[PDB]
Amino acid sequence: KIHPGVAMTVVRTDEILSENILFSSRASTSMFIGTPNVSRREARVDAVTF
Amino acid sequence: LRIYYSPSIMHRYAVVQPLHIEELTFGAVACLGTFSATDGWRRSAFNYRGSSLPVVEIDSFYSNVSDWEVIL
Amino acid sequence: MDLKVVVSLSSRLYTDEIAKMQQRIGCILPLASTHGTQNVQGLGLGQVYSLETVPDYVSMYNYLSDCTLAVLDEVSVDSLILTKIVPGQTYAIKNKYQPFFQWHGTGSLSVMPPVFGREHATVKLESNDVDIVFPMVLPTPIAEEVLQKILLFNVYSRVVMQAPGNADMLDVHMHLGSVSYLGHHYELALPEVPGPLGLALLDNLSLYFCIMVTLLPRASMRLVRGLIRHEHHDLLNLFQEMVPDEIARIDLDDLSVADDLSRMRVMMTYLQSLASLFNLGPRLATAAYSQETLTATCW
Amino acid sequence: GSGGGSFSWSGWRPPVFGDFLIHASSFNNAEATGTPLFQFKQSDPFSGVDAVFTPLSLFILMN
């Protein structure tokens, strides 16, 4: 426990969970909606995927 | 399959057995077909006469046999 | 039944890259995941082939044989639409490659990592800082020829590592890196140091070879000695009037048809095993072709 | 008349079936109904019955 010739700095990164609040002003984005689609695929021996 | 059988060939071909023309062939690999990936293997008990066996079961199989391929 | 994949880009790309990709319509490329929505990372052959890294080709064949293949169908500012190739379908397919070779319509095509070049094959997307690499497709004979070129160059770059002079490596570069097609020569980019998976494949080649070399039939050796001593054939052009020294030492034993026959049986049992290993890539069989359209009906 | 125009079902192929004739002792009557099977060719000419095995009988045969 002798002090060496040189000194040192120690750096670390820390994570903090945080519950945030988001405000949005009215009419800030225009959205265009499309018609939904349904297709089928992966026809396999016992099942179908949609 | 080569590296999965490496220790067994290392043991068998070794001092225990020398070579001869008809003994060189070691393993055979044949395909049985395709099965839906990401499902996996359900583990089930197969019960006969009050005795069980752990059995892997594979759903949605598609049978397709292939020829034998020689591995050594 | 319905085969369609849309790939969503987070940020819109510039005009230069939309033009460069619209040149690229009708391209075969692998994606990793089979879903309607794919991210831009899993797209293409990029994430295994890096600018800073030494090129390893067998690993790219390995990655490509597993990743699902799709055909470029539509290029937009935000979204890329690509159709998926299911194992059991027929596909009208288009040929426009820059290193183009002529197509028969007779023989299956094959897919391979971009051996010819990196720059003319790549597309950079600095809007989303990602690089897309289009693999190269070829008729099967030139594919197998290029593969043989690459593996033999691996072995001989390894061996001439301990060799005397520059002229020897210069002879190696002639007719190994270069593919000579009718009317042109083409320069494959070759690694200076092949270290990964070159071993893992050439070693299995060596196992098969050292197994086969014990059980050769002698009658073939005696026949070759007689024929190169008396007649001259184009397959016998290699051996001059000189006959090799190995054959003169192996031949001396007489002939017994039973042993040669059993050796032939075992050698065939191993040749069929050897044939499976040379592919290392997806093979797409072709049935019909139009030279005026550069369009095949692959399968 | 309306049907027949599907022209496939994603390439659907009906299963091919195989029907073997077995001795009463070789194949145990209780099995998992999904077990893989194996036919061993014999030598007798113009035969009428052929053998079959499951992985368990295949194990017992090899001791």
* Positions of E strands within chain C: 5-8, 28-31, 37-38, 68-75, 79-84, 91-94, 109-112, 122-125, 130-133, 136-139, 178-181, 184-187, 283-284, 286-290, 295-298
As given in the structure block, the two tokens for residue C102 are 């002529």
Chain breaks in chain C (C to N over 2.5 A) after: none
Residue C286 bridge partners (DSSP): C298
As given in the structure block, the two tokens for residue D31 are 């099995």
Q: Are C85 and C70 a contacting pair, CB within 8 Å? A: yes
As given in the structure block, the two tokens for residue C152 are 């033999």
User: How many residues comprise chain B?
Assistant: 72
DSSP symbol at B21: G
CA distances from C250 to C84, C189, C229, C236, C267 (A): 55, 41, 17, 19, 18
Dihedral of CA atoms C32, C35, C41, C42 in degrees, nearest 10, equals: 0
| Residue B28: closest CA among D62, D41, C269, D52 | C269
CA of A13 vs chain C CAs: smallest distance (Å): 26
Residue contacts between B and D (CB atoms, under 8 Å): 7
Q: Do strands C37-38 and C5-8 pair parallel, antiparallel, or not at all (unpaired)?
A: parallel
CA of D16 vs chain A CAs: smallest distance (Å): 14
**Which residues are within 8 A (CB) of C273 and not within 5 positions of it... i.e. 6 or more apart?**
B69, B70, B71, C208
As given in the structure block, the two tokens for residue C203 are 């070693």
Residue for token digits 């700095």? A9
Minimum CA–CA partner of D8 in chain C = C1
Q: Cβ A44–B62 below 8 Å, yes or no?
A: yes
Q: Cβ A40–C3 below 8 Å, yes or no?
A: no
Tell me the C-alpha distance between C19 and C21, whole Å. 5
Resolution of this model in Å is 4.0
Residues 9-68 in B contacting C (C-alpha not used; CB under 8 Å): 19, 21-22, 24-25, 67
The subunits that touch chain D, with at least 3 C-beta pairs less than 8 Å apart, are A, B, C
Tell me the C-alpha distance between B58 and B60, whole Å. 7
CA distances from A23 to A20, C126, C145, D8 (A): 10, 32, 64, 54
Amino acid at C229: R
Minimum CA–CA partner of C3 in chain D = D10
Tell me the C-alpha distance between C132 and C29, whole Å. 9
Residues of chain B contacting C259 with CB distance shorter than 8 Å: 21
Q: Are C68 and C34 a contacting pair, CB within 8 Å? A: yes
Helical residues (DSSP H) of C160-217, grouped into ranges? 166-173, 198-212
- Residue B43: its H or E element: strand B42-48
CA distances from C209 to A30, C34, C204, C216, C273 (A): 69, 39, 8, 11, 12
Inter-helix orientation angle C198-212/C57-66, to 10°:
90
Tell me the C-alpha distance between C279 and B66, whole Å. 17
SS3 C213: helix
Residues of chain A contacting D10 with CB distance shorter than 8 Å: 41, 43
Tell me the C-alpha distance between C268 and C265, whole Å. 5
The subunits that touch chain A, with at least 3 C-beta pairs less than 8 Å apart, are B, C, D
Residue for token digits 């600095």? C126
- Residue C228: its H or E element: helix C218-230
Solved with: cryo-EM
CA of D1 vs chain B CAs: smallest distance (Å): 32
SS3 C186: strand
In this structure, how many other beta carbons lie within 10 angstroms of the beta carbon of residue C219?
A: 15
CA of C86 vs chain A CAs: smallest distance (Å): 10
Give the 3-state secondary structure percentages of chain B, helix then strand then coil, rounded to 5: 20, 35, 45
The subunits that touch chain B, with at least 3 C-beta pairs less than 8 Å apart, are A, C, D
Amino acid at B70: V
Q: Cβ B32–D30 below 8 Å, yes or no?
A: no
Residues of D with CB under 8 A from a CB of A: 9-10, 12
In this structure, how many other beta carbons lie within 10 angstroms of the beta carbon of residue C147?
A: 20
Query: CB-CB: which of C204, C262, C272 is closest to B21?
Result: C262
Q: Are B64 and B34 a contacting pair, CB within 8 Å? A: yes
Q: Do strands C295-298 and C283-284 pair parallel, antiparallel, or not at all (unpaired)?
A: unpaired
| Residue C96: closest CA among C170, C2, C28, C29 | C28
Best mutation target among A45, A46, A48 (most B Cβ atoms within 10 Å) is A45
Best mutation target among B48, B58, B65 (most D Cβ atoms within 10 Å) is B48
Residue C40 bridge partners (DSSP): none
What string of DSSP letters covers D16-55? P-------TTTS-S---SS---B------TT-S----B-H
Residues 10-39 in A contacting D (C-alpha not used; CB under 8 Å): none
Residues of chain B contacting C66 with CB distance shorter than 8 Å: none
